Amino acid sequence: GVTIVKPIVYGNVARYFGKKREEDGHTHQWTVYVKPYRNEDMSAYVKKIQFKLHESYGNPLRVVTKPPYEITETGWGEFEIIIKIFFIDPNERPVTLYHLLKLFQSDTNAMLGKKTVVSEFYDEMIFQDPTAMMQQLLTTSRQLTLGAYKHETEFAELEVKTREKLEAAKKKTSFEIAELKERLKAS
Amino acid sequence: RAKAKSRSSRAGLQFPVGRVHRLLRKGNYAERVGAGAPVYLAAVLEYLTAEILELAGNAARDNKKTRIIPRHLQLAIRNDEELNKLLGRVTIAQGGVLPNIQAVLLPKKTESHHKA
Amino acid sequence: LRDNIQGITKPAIRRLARRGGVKRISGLIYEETRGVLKVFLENVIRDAVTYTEHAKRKTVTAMDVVYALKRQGRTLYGFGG
Amino acid sequence: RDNIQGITKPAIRRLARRGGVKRISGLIYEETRGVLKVFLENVIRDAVTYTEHAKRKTVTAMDVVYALKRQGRTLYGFGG
Amino acid sequence: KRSRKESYSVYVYKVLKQVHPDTGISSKAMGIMNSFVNDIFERIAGEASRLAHYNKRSTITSREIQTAVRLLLPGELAKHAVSEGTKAVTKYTSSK
Amino acid sequence: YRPGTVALREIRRYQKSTELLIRKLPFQRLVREIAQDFKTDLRFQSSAVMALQEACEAYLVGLFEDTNLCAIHAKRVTIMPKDIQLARRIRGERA
DNA sequence: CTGGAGAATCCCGGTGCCGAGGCCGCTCAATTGGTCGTAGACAGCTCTAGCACCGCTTAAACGCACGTACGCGCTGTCCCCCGCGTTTTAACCGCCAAGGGGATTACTCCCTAGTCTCCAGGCACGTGTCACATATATACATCCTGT
């Protein structure tokens, strides 16, 4: 009768090189990742997360161990990445996630000239009737970082949300300086 | 009282026999240090320092420098057969290993006349 | 943290090998070098923090690192004062 | 005297067999003899120094134990 | 309220100048030389202490230090240090 | 050129000079991350970090020398992982 | 790939030899009880680094492209270690004198060394300059332009 929910967020960010590789054939540097929504260390209950990429790569099955869980790799096309989350408790069934590697922008986002592509989805790992050890591990998770934790799902809108404040404050300071100090010098 | 004479001057050593004996008596190395132990220790320290300084100055003069630097100390320690045996485990900050000569590149391969 | 062991890039390991007389370096040598340097730093910093905590101090002094290296047989001159 | 040949070919062969070796080169014996001679010379020099310091005429086993301890070869079974 | 720390820079620069009048030494080279001095000090002291302890002796004497110098310094380096120490002891007891 | 030139000149140069081959800033973050696992909110004196870097560089130079020797042992000029592995095993670090 | 031998192990039970264990009897060394200066611990106080940034500059790390050079496998064949049987020899004895060579114990004794003073001079610290590095007038010095 014990149910513990661990919210997570998985996805990938991609950056366009601006030109296709000379002889390789890659166009975007992308980083698939799995990270928690709440500021907590997932490794307290996660043993390893495997990322099975396309067979075209030398090693399709990547692995990570610690709270980040990101592999940086370059590619040329979009494909489905199978993410399998293994827990410390071997009696707990691993969780399998399916994420579509997104590298290209939509026409609307392309017209905006934004360089970074982002696609991560909100998810929750439901542990129904977990073992005593797994329950303790889930309940004893510590905080990961001292700062805040954020997500840029789409980014198209988060960039505008950030700019509306950043550029506003920057322009206000620039004006307060230029309009006032020149007249102060005039006096 | 009579003009006090230090123990470094009596024996004829530059390093401090007094400070040596001081570190020894309250260093817990023994219960009652002998009067001659510190003299001998300071003498050996002085001899080793003089030797390494001679070698470092020789290396500096060979390198056309006036101020001794970790480079010279490392070179001197690794060139001498016995000092390297004594200081094999030691590492020195801002030091370096003995280098190799690049003259071997010239009579094997260099840039050709192609678009020179 | 943000995978700081990767802060030792290929040029640095290549320079270290050059100084060590190495003539040519393989591709996988860099991972082995980062893993060996990591293991060495682990022991050194463990000894240093053991000397520090015992002193009830919040700062890892240079003398702590010197004593740690001296325990490993890696006596280091230059920071004795 | 020159009795360093007391460490004969079969002795070195057995010492190597104990070390996992199954095939030894011909020139291995004259090198092993020199290595063992140097190791001895060193340990025996240390032991003789320890003995002369004690004003004793006999090189006790504990002196050999200390000499080995100096070289890092701590030998248990003889006193320390 | 001063927190003074000691060093051998005073006896090493003197030794340097007496053996190399024209050649100086940098501050970091001086620190390295002081570290070497302290390391050899510790080595000789520990060796003499252990040697005295082996003979059930509670006092480190000049003989213990002499044998420790014989043991530590390798090949044709010990002899010179032993001779210097003996000549300094003989000139020290002679009240000169 | 090819495998035979600039490596030798780089050897000569980096052996003549004695500057720190590893960058200070990236190595400091590595040291702090390694220390994190022992004591939270730990401070390090600059000289301590410099000494750590010097010791690490010296150890790595010695390891690469022993590894260059292992590579030459097998009639090879390139140092492979098994070379470093053998150097460490005979050293007694990972026997 | 089995047979078919054929040695090598290796169960497995047996049997005295002698080290392992135990018990006894003192000796000595850890405990007890109590006094007595330190050790260091802890409560402040100071101010030195340590950390944390931020900006500008650019070396440098880095990815890519592109051969060449070195790595690995293959092959041939040809020396030099292995396996094993014979002659050699050194390593065990045993012998036959008659006594010491040297660690070990012990007792005076006595120089040497701790302890504990008071001092004063010699070595950490503050300050005075001088060798090398830095940034800027300058007297021409090379294109550009009236002419």
Numbering used by the authors:
A (entry chain W): 18 to 204
B (entry chain A): 11 to 126
C (entry chain D): 22 to 102
D (entry chain H): 23 to 102
E (entry chain B): 27 to 122
F (entry chain C): 41 to 135
The study reports:
The ATP-dependent chromatin remodeler SRCAP complex (SRCAP-C) promotes the replacement of canonical histone H2A–H2B dimer with H2A.Z–H2B dimer. Here, we determined structures of human SRCAP-C bound to H2A-containing nucleosome at near-atomic resolution. SRCAP-C can be divided into motor and ARP modules, which merge at the ATPase of the SRCAP subunit.
The ADP-bound state of SRCAP-C–NCP is a post-hydrolysis state, where the ADP tends to dissociate from the ATP-binding site. The nucleosomal DNA spanning positions 47–60 (with the entry end numbered position 1 as a reference point) exhibits distortion, and this distortion is more pronounced in the ADP-bound state. The RUVBL1–RUVBL2 hexamer-associated ARP6–ZNHIT1 dimer dissociates from the motor-proximal H2A–H2B and relocates near the dyad of the nucleosome, causing a displacement of up to 81 Å. As a result, the movement of the ARP6–ZNHIT1 dimer might lead to the dissociation of the positively charged N-terminal region of ZNHIT1 from the acidic patch of H2A–H2B. The entry DNA undergoes unwrapping from the histone octamer by ~15 bp, which would otherwise cause a steric clash with the relocated ARP6–ZNHIT1. Consistent with the entry DNA detachment, the cryo-EM map in the ADP-bound state showed the absence of the H2A C-terminal tail and the presence of density extending out of the H2A core and winding over the subdomain4 of ARP6. It suggests that the density is derived from the H2A tail (residues 110–127) and the basic motif (H123HKAKGK129, positively charged residues are underlined) may generate charge–charge interactions with the acidic pocket of ARP6. By contrast, in SRCAP-C–nucleosome structures (ADP- and ADP-BeFx-bound states), histone octamer remains in canonical conformation and DNA unwrapping was only observed in the ADP-bound state, in which ZNHIT1 binds neither the entry DNA nor the H2A–H2B dimer.
